[PDB]
């Protein structure tokens, strides 16, 4: 329906949803919600609704603006708004808080547990607050407004705000005349009869694109997946048995990165990556391209021996699955048996994105020619060698 | 007025939406969702809805609290809530499960595949359940729910909970007068006529701070970035060939972690980190500090041969780019040619966060003095050696 039945109820719901909007936000117009900045367990907000009007109003409200008058200003009620009118008259709101450390906003010191907003009844007969509340609840459902509890209440001034001397559920008030009449009998001159509209801050609160609202402890960020009714989630957990937080990705089968860096002993690292290497024929030095490091990290390299022999040039080790080794060169140039070994050296220097790698195999003297690639007691950049090259980046 | 239909449908969607939220949570207030603790393939939850109220209420519900009643308690419905009212009267909910091992919650034994919430029709004429259902679909659309998978059913008790003896789509009930009457012809008193509500969230639905709302399949979590008009996104994809899920971070240039662990063949590992090592002068063992492992993982170490010769103490292998090797100590203390080699051993023991590394080079006998660091056939902890140290953590 597009027609207003109760016009007081229409106004109550509007004010009620805007209180709902306000309570669900950590930030308003790029600034911390003022009500989160204190550390008190209870605070009562006045019926004049100053606390809900913008700071840029002719008379200043408490809701912050962006300071810049070029921006759109998020607002809750108009500057001249007054809801102390009609049979159900706004009387103030009781916010209850719990202490809270926000993971990223030191201005926030508490979180809202519940809001109870009071509308005192001014109709000629006290029992008609039942009917008026019924129009509020009906108008709420018509407008998509979800409160968490509706009650008829008697409230009295407190040291701080108010407290509820007596309360009765809306349903028991309309269905049980005995409870109703007994309740109305407690409505002495010092008490205020009122409709209590209760908001409870739950896990339903919306996550904001500015990140001002945190996920609840141990909750899971989930994706629907083509497995059908399967769900694949991640979360940030804390295990006190080691005082550490964990970004838990173990529900997903593979984490796929492009670049990847991690820390070891305070230093930043990339994973070690390996290649299988042999020298080209002819005893020429080896060049290996240096990996691209993320900015602020530097190249590292290490070569470790996999296979070797004293064949020098008379060998092919380039296949990982078999080794061809044809003996050591003799003084007459012929291939003899394999000479005995005394050392292997692997050397490497970085020069403009290229790792220059040289090697030597030291062998028994008195066997090799006097000159050449294999000579004296040295086999230079030999083919009779396979090494594993490891690269990583670090700071 | 007969807009109590819409108001009744509002309550159906309100209650069903909360059941969906509960059904999507692995933990509620830091405790396992009680419904996930069992291992049966079906469970029916009663219409009085105590299983959906908080345990800390005047009458105790089944939903856990933290234990500190000053904390915020995530909740679903008020404790005085009752939905067994109106023409569509809540009759209970049918949960269907599959078994599941949660990677971080041993208390969870199953995962929810589907929840169906039943509302028995108590209207005056049974053929009007179709009209009532039309209002539920409208209220669903108003709260962001698909409203496309609805059916009218007859339900009766089973060995476990209930089962749907007959069902007809909401569309056939409204458009197919023949099928409608054939269905209604089965609505005997032994069975219960009901609307069966299975809610699916459109893409408009807001992400909630408790995480009950999952991203749609193939959707991306994105950030605005200073790359300007570029946004950098991640997503969780499922591949039907291979039946695996992937967390795709490849749209971001570098993933920067602190500690990092992964799995290989069911076992947990940290990435290997490497250092270039030599022994310093004097034949003394080498101490290398052990990495600090994530809780539950233990230190591993491996040393591999890079360069060596038989010079023993007469060497400097500490530069990666050149090796200094002055030959083997002779019996008279002088430096001779490089002896021939028979073995190299690298040994390591972890004692109190320190890896104690020792090495021996075995060489031909009859050359070394009888005493000293290089004596007999052994060059002890020689300088004529470079090794790469690999450390990692595993379980």
């Amino acid at each position: 329906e597009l027609m207003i039945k109760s016009s007081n109820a229409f106004d109550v719901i509007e004010l009620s949803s805007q209180i709902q909007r306000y309570a669900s936000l950590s930030k308003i117009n790029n600034r911390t919600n003022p009500i989160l900045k204190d550390n008190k367990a209870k605070e009562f907000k006045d019926a004049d609704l100053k606390w809900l009007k913008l700071e840029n109003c002719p008379t200043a409200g408490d809701v912050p603006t962006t300071g810049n008058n070029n921006d759109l200003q998020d607002q809750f009620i108009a500057c001249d708004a007054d809801y102390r009118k009609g049979d159900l008259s706004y009387f103030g709101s009781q916010f209850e808080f719990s202490t809270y450390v926000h993971p990223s906003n030191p201005e926030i010191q508490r979180q809202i547990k519940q809001v109870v907003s009071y509308f005192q009844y001014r109709g000629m007969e006290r029992a008609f607050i039942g009917d008026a509340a019924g129009y509020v609840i009906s108008e709420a459902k018509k407008k998509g407004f979800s409160a968490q509890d509706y009650r008829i209440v008697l409230i009295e001034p407190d040291r701080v705000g108010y407290f509820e001397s007596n309360a009765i559920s809306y349903e028991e008030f309309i269905e049980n005349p005995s409870a109703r009449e007994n309740f109305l009998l407690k409505a002495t001159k010092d008490r205020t009869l009122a409709l209590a509209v209760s908001l409870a801050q739950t896990g339903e609160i919306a996550m904001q694109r500015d990140g001002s609202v945190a996920f609840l402890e141990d909750s899971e960020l989930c994706w629907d997946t083509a497995a059908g009714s399967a769900k694949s989630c991640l979360s940030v957990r804390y295990d006190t048995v080691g005082n550490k937080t964990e970004l838990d990705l173990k529900q997903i089968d593979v984490v796929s990165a492009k670049g990847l860096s991690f820390e070891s002993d305070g230093k930043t690292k990339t994973p070690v990556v390996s290649t299988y290497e042999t020298f080209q024929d002819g005893g020429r030095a080896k060049t290996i391209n240096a990996i691209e490091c993320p900015t602020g990290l530097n190249n590292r390299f290490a070569a470790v021996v996999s296979s070797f022999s004293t064949a020098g040039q008379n060998a092919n080790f380039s296949s990982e699955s078999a080794k061809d080794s044809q003996g050591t060169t003799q003084k007459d140039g012929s291939k003899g048996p394999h000479a005995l070994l005394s050392g292997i050296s692997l050397n490497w220097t970085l020069t403009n994105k290229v790792w220059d790698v040289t090697a030597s195999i030291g062998i028994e003297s008195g066997i090799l020619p006097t000159s050449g690639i294999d000579s004296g007691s040295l086999l230079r950049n030999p083919k009779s060698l396979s090494f594993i090259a490891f690269q990583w980046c670090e700071n | 007025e007969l807009m109590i239909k819409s108001s009744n449908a509002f309550d159906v969607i309100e209650l069903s939406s909360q059941i969906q939220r509960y059904a999507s949570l692995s933990k509620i207030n830091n405790r396992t969702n009680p419904i996930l603790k069992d291992n049966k393939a079906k469970e029916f939850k009663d219409a009085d809805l105590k299983w959906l109220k908080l345990e800390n209420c005047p009458t105790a519900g089944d939903v856990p609290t933290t234990g500190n009643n000053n904390d915020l308690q995530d909740q679903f419905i008020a404790c005085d809530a009752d939905y067994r009212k109106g023409d569509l009267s809540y009759f209970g909910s049918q949960f269907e499960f599959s078994t599941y091992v949660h990677p971080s919650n041993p208390e969870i034994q199953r995962q929810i595949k589907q929840v169906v919430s039943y509302f028995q029709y108590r209207g005056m004429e049974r053929a009007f359940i179709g009209d009532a259902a039309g209002y539920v679909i409208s209220e669903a659309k108003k709260k962001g729910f698909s409203a496309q998978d609805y059916r009218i059913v007859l339900i009766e008790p089973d060995r476990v909970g209930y089962f749907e003896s007959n069902a007809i789509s909401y569309e056939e009930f409204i458009e197919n007068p023949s099928a409608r009457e054939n269905f209604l012809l089965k609505a005997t008193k032994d069975r219960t006529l009901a609307l069966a509500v299975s809610l699916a969230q459109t893409g408009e639905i807001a992400m909630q701070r408790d995480g009950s709302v999952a991203f749609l399949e193939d959707s991306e979590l994105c950030w605005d970035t200073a790359a300007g008009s570029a946004k950098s996104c991640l997503s969780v994809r499922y591949d039907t060939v291979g039946n695996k899920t992937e967390l795709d971070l490849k749209q971001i240039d570098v993933v920067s972690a602190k500690g990092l662990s992964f799995e290989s063949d069911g076992k947990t590992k940290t990435p290997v980190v490497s250092t270039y090592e030599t022994f310093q002068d004097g034949g003394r063992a080498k101490t290398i500090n052990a990495i600090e492992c994530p809780t539950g993982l233990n230190n591993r170490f491996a040393a591999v041969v890079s360069s060596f010769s038989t010079a023993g103490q007469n060497a400097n292998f500490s530069s990666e780019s050149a090796k200094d090797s002055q030959g083997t100590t002779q019996k008279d203390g002088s430096k001779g040619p490089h002896a021939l080699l028979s073995g190299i051993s690298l040994n390591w023991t972890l004692t109190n966060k320190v890896w104690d590394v020792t090495a021996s080079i075995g060489i031909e006998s009859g050359i070394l003095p009888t005493s000293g660091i290089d004596s007999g056939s052994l060059l002890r902890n020689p300088k004529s050696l470079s090794f790469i140290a690999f450390q990692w953590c595993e379980n």
Binding site: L340, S342, G343, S345, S360, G362, I363, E364, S365, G366, I367, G376, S377, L378 | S309, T310, K323, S325, G327, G336, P337, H338, A339, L340, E364, I367
Partner: peptide, 11 residues
Amino acid sequence: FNDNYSSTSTV
């Protein structure tokens, strides 16, 4: 190794 490197022998 530089070219000064030499070893024992079986000859």
